[PDB]
Symmetry: C6
Subunit: 103 residues, 6 copies
Amino acid sequence: PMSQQAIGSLETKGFPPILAAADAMVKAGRITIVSYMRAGSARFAVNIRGDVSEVKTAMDAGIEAAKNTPGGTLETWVIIPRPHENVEAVFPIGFGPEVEQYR
Amino acid sequence: QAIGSLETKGFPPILAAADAMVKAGRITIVSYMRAGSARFAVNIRGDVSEVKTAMDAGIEAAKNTPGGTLETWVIIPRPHENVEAVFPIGFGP
Amino acid sequence: PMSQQAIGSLETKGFPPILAAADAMVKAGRITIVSYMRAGSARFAVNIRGDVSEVKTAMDAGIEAAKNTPGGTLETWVIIPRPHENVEAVFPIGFGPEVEQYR
Amino acid sequence: QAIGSLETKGFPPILAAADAMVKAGRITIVSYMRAGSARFAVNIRGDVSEVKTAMDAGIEAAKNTPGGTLETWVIIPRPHENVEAVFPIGFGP
Amino acid sequence: PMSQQAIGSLETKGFPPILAAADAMVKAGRITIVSYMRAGSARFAVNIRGDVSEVKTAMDAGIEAAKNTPGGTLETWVIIPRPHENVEAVFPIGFGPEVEQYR
Amino acid sequence: QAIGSLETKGFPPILAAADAMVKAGRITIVSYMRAGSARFAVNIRGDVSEVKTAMDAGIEAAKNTPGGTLETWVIIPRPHENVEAVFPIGFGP
């Protein structure tokens, strides 16, 4: 009941910084971007999956890209190495059929 | 079964809380609520003693998350059945 | 054109305090919880129906439960003894088929 | 028919306003708007003299509600028909 | 690829001031109200179309009506004389079938 | 193709930005995002040199709009294809 793949989630204020973060993340490690969350208050979170070491290196790049985007604000981030299956069942952080082609 | 509900500012800390809760007691995460203003609540069910231990872990995980903040939480030991008929805190699919 | 049953509505900041309020309300009087409103800004309202004397005693318990929830904030409440039918027609405060079994 | 629209912060005060309005004049409540930021607007229609009396009662009910606040209101006597084609202030189902 | 008709868009805080603006606009010039946008934070925008000279006179009336509504706030407005077709394709500012009868 | 994204407070300034961008370079406006808190983002695609010229025009149009404010913007020259599989920045219908 715990997934093999880590989750990393990063949240910005602003849509352009989340795109910056997402692109930097997938260019920095063997990770898949699985989903995004429109959180309200102009905040957005991006969710990535991969082995924890790869998610950590991806997260470092996403953090920098968010902060370096003009007018962007990094709000919060987390890495969970081996998330319980019930988390994946309830939250939109699983692998959907549109990202299979990239994994 | 008891209900525990915990609410954070930010999506990453609600994930952290949820994962910590289900790894700390015999509970089921049944739903989450997008509250607006970048707040999210996670709802768990279990025997009250298990919900309590889970809640303690979830509070700590939310506060320990980079940039995460804990807003509010509750434990209701034996909720009236009318509550889960109206609020999305039941077990069913 | 005025209902036999009062409406009570109570609004909190935070989802956990609204659950606290709702549970305290239905445990304190002969009332039915009919609906909730996601108001934005992390505010939620719960709507109950019953005879006005029962809604008043329920409301007192809901107010206390909201205020006593960790991090919860009570925002606003009302009791309308005999609401006009047009209010029930437009606002989601009627009795739905999922709560018949509890009334 | 005239349109009256009244907006509160909070859901309980919009209920109070709506009920007071329909009990104060020959008007029909046609819709409500969830505006965001916990604001709600109620929309009524009737002859303008009736909408005026109703509006006065609704303003007082909103302000009199525990924790309720009145944000903004308007009365438009004879709205152009293009307005109700776009905004949800018409009578129809 | 640029429309013959200008767009004017006006945004208020509050729903009653947007109704005031919309009504004043269509009473002040040969314009069609095409749509409204629920922007969040209790802000609303109304979108009108017409020849630019007509949209300008309509906009002046909408600005005044918004400001003069009890508790209303004017937030922002624009007039674009000859919008590119790609703007109409992506943003909800075109003529829909419900407003044909008024144009 | 590159992605440019520009976000304003207010709906009128996003229209201004979008129109200025497509009139300043060989770009396609592919989508907009209602972000909440009355913020909106417009997303454009094109060769990066064209997206840059378009972005400059969009920044100026947003700031020049009465009451409009520019919040944030970005240009990504060569986005990874996983980004447009998840975010609504692709070309398709």
